[PDB]
Design an enzyme around this catalytic site. Structure first.
Site, PDB file in Angstrom:
ATOM      1  N   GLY A 167       0.795  -1.205   0.000  1.00 56.01           N
ATOM      2  CA  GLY A 167       0.000   0.000   0.000  1.00 56.01           C
ATOM      3  C   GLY A 167       0.832   1.261   0.000  1.00 56.01           C
ATOM      4  N   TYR A 174      -9.607   0.051  -2.338  1.00 60.51           N
ATOM      5  CA  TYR A 174     -10.531   0.234  -1.220  1.00 60.51           C
ATOM      6  C   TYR A 174     -11.972   0.224  -1.689  1.00 60.51           C
ATOM      7  CZ  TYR A 174      -6.504   1.682   1.626  1.00 60.51           C
ATOM      8  OH  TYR A 174      -5.315   1.701   2.322  1.00 60.51           O
ATOM      9  N   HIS A 185      -5.053  11.191   9.953  1.00 64.18           N
ATOM     10  CA  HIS A 185      -3.678  10.736   9.890  1.00 64.18           C
ATOM     11  C   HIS A 185      -2.881  11.441   8.811  1.00 64.18           C
ATOM     12  CE1 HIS A 185      -5.530   8.568   6.613  1.00 64.18           C
ATOM     13  NE2 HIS A 185      -4.336   8.195   6.190  1.00 64.18           N
ATOM     14  N   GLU A 187       0.426  10.313   6.141  1.00 69.19           N
ATOM     15  CA  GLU A 187       0.900   9.079   5.540  1.00 69.19           C
ATOM     16  C   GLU A 187       2.068   8.535   6.342  1.00 69.19           C
ATOM     17  OE1 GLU A 187      -0.920   7.671   3.023  1.00 69.19           O
ATOM     18  OE2 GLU A 187      -2.121   9.347   3.756  1.00 69.19           O
ATOM     19  N   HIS A 273      -5.464  14.229   7.232  1.00 69.04           N
ATOM     20  CA  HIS A 273      -6.711  14.103   6.511  1.00 69.04           C
ATOM     21  C   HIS A 273      -7.548  12.962   7.052  1.00 69.04           C
ATOM     22  CE1 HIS A 273      -3.504  11.889   4.440  1.00 69.04           C
ATOM     23  NE2 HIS A 273      -4.418  10.990   4.118  1.00 69.04           N
ATOM     24  N   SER A 285      -5.083   3.508  -4.196  1.00 73.69           N
ATOM     25  CA  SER A 285      -4.105   4.443  -3.627  1.00 73.69           C
ATOM     26  C   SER A 285      -2.729   3.835  -3.347  1.00 73.69           C
ATOM     27  CB  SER A 285      -4.652   5.067  -2.342  1.00 73.69           C
ATOM     28  OG  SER A 285      -4.507   4.178  -1.249  1.00 73.69           O
TER      29      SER A 285
END
Ligand SMILES: O=C(O)C[C@H](C(=O)O)[C@H](O)C(=O)O
Ligand code: NI
Ligand SMILES: [Zn+2]
EC number: 1.14.11.66
Length: 350
Positions: A167, A174, A185, A187, A273, A285
């Protein structure tokens, strides 16, 4: 000079032509030259020309190995989300559960109404999220904005060490339904992410400017002191949900945006975000980097309690892009301070 552009740190939207769309890193450098990163989040609408796949009828039999049932506990705009893993299921199976009367989108007028219902019923009727599915929906030959092979400097991780982090430098898919959430969070290693919504209902986003990110953390520590004491970065557990009214109430600046099928979102280093899906949809993603990210990577505060284990060795990046600072850095004397308003160096061309 950089402070001049997007001084309100608002979420910007971009409509690149096909010529601009062709070079990924170039356009990222571009939207940053316009101050897009200051919001922590940007939308990019690809040319109508472009499509990553001819048809999504091929996929009802694709397996979701680890569906996640999202239990949410809390009140007064503060929530903790618990994951319950369900047995595997197919896209057809998921869509059936998703579109059922039990789990489908309620009727509504304006977006603000769907949003208020979301924050009102967050803790009821726990949904299922077809999350962290290894794979891509890009057609093999699509060479533009291919999440499977963006060709950024994040590639130095696999190139140097053979290491793949699922990921992060590989793609994830998703599958969402109504009221499925992603918690606040940044990244891993405070990298960028790119998110493409292949099809389905919209995904709505909240975002806090990186230049105010520390203030969101202060708030989060204050509201979740036990979690704060047990981990230096508990928000990386992705279990913490905080409503816009709550942020508003404590003066944390933020912006909202809703992502439509066929749209890209870019999140930027140290951009907090969160958000939710409107109904049945599918998103793809991965993470990526630019030269600017490196300093963020060096300074990233990581999960100390072993719930989040993703750790990228910064050594290769500093050696190759900060050679004058390697000795200093390796000896812990590198006190570079990060300016969240500056664009990545690759944008010198612009
Ligand atoms: O949904 C999640 O659990 C993470 C989310 C996503 O990938 O959809 C992420 O915000 C991102 O898009 O970068
Ligand atoms: Ni994310
Ligand atoms: Zn932790």
């Amino acid at each position: 000079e950089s402070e001049t552009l997007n001084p309100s740190a608002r979420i910007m939207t971009f409509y690149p032509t096909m010529e601009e769309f062709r070079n990924f890193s170039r356009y990222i450098a571009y939207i940053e030259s316009q101050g897009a990163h200051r919001a922590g989040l940007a939308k990019v609408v690809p040319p109508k020309e472009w499509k990553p796949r001819a048809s999504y009828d091929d996929i009802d039999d694709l397996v979701i190995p680890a569906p996640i049932q999202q239990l949410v506990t809390g009140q007064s705009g503060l929530f903790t989300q618990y994951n319950i893993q369900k047995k595997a299921m197919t896209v057809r199976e998921f869509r059936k559960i998703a579109n059922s009367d039990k789990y489908c989108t309620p009727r509504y007028s304006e977006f603000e109404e769907l949003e208020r219902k979301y924050w009102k019923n967050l803790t009821f009727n726990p949904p299922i999220y077809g999350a962290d599915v290894n794979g891509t929906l890009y057609e093999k030959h699509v060479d533009e904005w291919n999440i499977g092979r963006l060709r950024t400097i994040l590639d130095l991780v696999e190139k140097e060490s053979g290491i793949t982090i699922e990921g992060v430098n590989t793609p994830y898919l998703y599958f969402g339904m109504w009221k499925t959430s992603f918690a606040w969070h940044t990244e891993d290693m405070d990298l960028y992410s790119i998110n493409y919504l292949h099809f389905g209902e919209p995904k709505s986003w909240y975002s806090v400017p990186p230049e105010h990110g520390k203030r969101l953390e202060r708030l989060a520590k204050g509201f979740f002191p036990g979690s704060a004491q047990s981990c230096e970065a508990f928000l990386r557990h992705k279990m913490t949900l905080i409503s816009p009214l709550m942020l508003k109430k404590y003066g944390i600046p933020f912006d909202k945006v809703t992502q439509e099928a066929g749209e890209f979102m870019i999140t930027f280093p140290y951009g907090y975000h969160a958000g939710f899906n409107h109904g049945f949809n599918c998103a793809e993603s991965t993470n990526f980097a630019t030269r600017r990210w490196i300093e963020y990577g060096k300074q990233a505060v990581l999960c100390s309690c072993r719930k989040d284990m993703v750790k990228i060795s910064m050594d290769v990046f500093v050696r190759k892009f900060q050679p004058e600072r390697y000795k200093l850095w390796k000896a812990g004397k590198d006190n570079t301070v990060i300016d969240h308003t500056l664009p990545t160096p690759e944008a010198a061309e612009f």
